[PDB]
A paper describes a structure:
Erythromycin resistance methyltransferases (Erms) confer resistance to macrolide, lincosamide, and streptogramin antibiotics in Gram-positive bacteria and mycobacteria. Using SAM as a cofactor, Erms transfer a methyl group to adenosine at position 2058 (A2058) in the ∼3000 nucleotide-long 23S ribosomal RNA. This subtle posttranscriptional modification blocks the antibiotic-binding site in the ribosomal peptide exit tunnel. Erm38 features at its N-terminal catalytic domain the classic Rossmann fold, an α/β sandwich that contains the SAM cofactor-binding site and a helical C-terminal domain.
Here, we present crystal structures of Erm38 from Mycobacterium smegmatis in apoprotein and cofactor-bound forms. Erm38 comprises 386 amino acids (NCBI WP_063844518; Uniport Q79N53), with analysis using the Database of Disordered Protein Predictions predicting that the N-terminal 12 residues and C-terminal 124 residues are disordered regions. We therefore expressed a truncated version of Erm38 spanning residues 13 to 261. This truncated Erm38, referred to as Erm38 throughout, has a molecular mass of 30 kDa and a size similar to most Erms from Gram-positive bacteria. The highly purified Erm38 formed square plate crystals that diffracted to a maximum resolution of 1.9 Å and tolerated up to 20% dimethylsulfoxide, which makes them suitable for ligand-soaking experiments. The electrostatic potential of Erm38 includes a highly positively charged region that comprises residues R119, R140, R141, R142, and K166 located at the protein surface. As these solvent-exposed basic residues are likely to be involved in binding the RNA substrate, we produced an alanine mutant for each site and compared the enzymatic activities of the mutant and WT enzymes. The E61K, R119A, R140A, and R141A mutations resulted in >90% reduction in methylation activity, whereas the R142A mutation resulted in 75% loss of enzymatic activity. One reason for the paucity of information about Erm-RNA structures is the adventitious precipitation of the Erm–RNA complex when the 32-mer RNA substrate is mixed with the apoprotein.
Author numbering: 13 to 83, 85 to 225, 227 to 259
The structure:
Amino acid sequence: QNFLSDRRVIADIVEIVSRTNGPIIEIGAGDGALTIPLQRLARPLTAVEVDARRARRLAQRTARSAPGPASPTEVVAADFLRYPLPRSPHVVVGNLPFHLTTAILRRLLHGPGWTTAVLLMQWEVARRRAAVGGATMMTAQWWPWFEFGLARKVSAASFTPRPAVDAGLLTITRRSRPLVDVADRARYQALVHRVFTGRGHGMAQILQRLPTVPRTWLRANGIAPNSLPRQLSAAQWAALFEQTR
């Protein structure tokens, strides 16, 4: 949709991806703005492009710049939302269509194997996922399993055609030691939803009006009674879940 035309952003993404290890899967491969540079990292690479005609053209481009038939990126003409991710370690890299960002993020967050994701998306979504100015409900809902980092802002002028809003480069890393067991994910995410939408002014007031916490719990866990849900850390949410489960 909005193809990346700024080579400096390509350099920045390749720099981040170069510090990771293992196979790479790229979403929204387009004409190969990131695929060709990632292929030069000499690691196994799969490039996913939903437009079959464009994917056929990309397969010719990757093959031409590859060492040769004996040594080789796999180009897949598929919708990433239907693409089965391997259960083995890999890194995901993508330039996401802005209207599909939340759906692709949910697909990845529920998916297996990937240890790092490097994703280009809307600046406002990337800021919220990385908890800039505080966490949002969706960020806190996934924090026991993943960490999020805002690598850089990317102007709408870095794409052709230009999108209506600016973009952000977001990194996501799968925690090797989850803070909450994956089997308790639904119950954990429901608790987070309940606190972010509960009535009351400050954590002390919100936790009193919920159907689940000792009077001494907040301050014992380093939480100011007037604090907002967006100010809690991942460890504090995991401790609240352990307390109310």
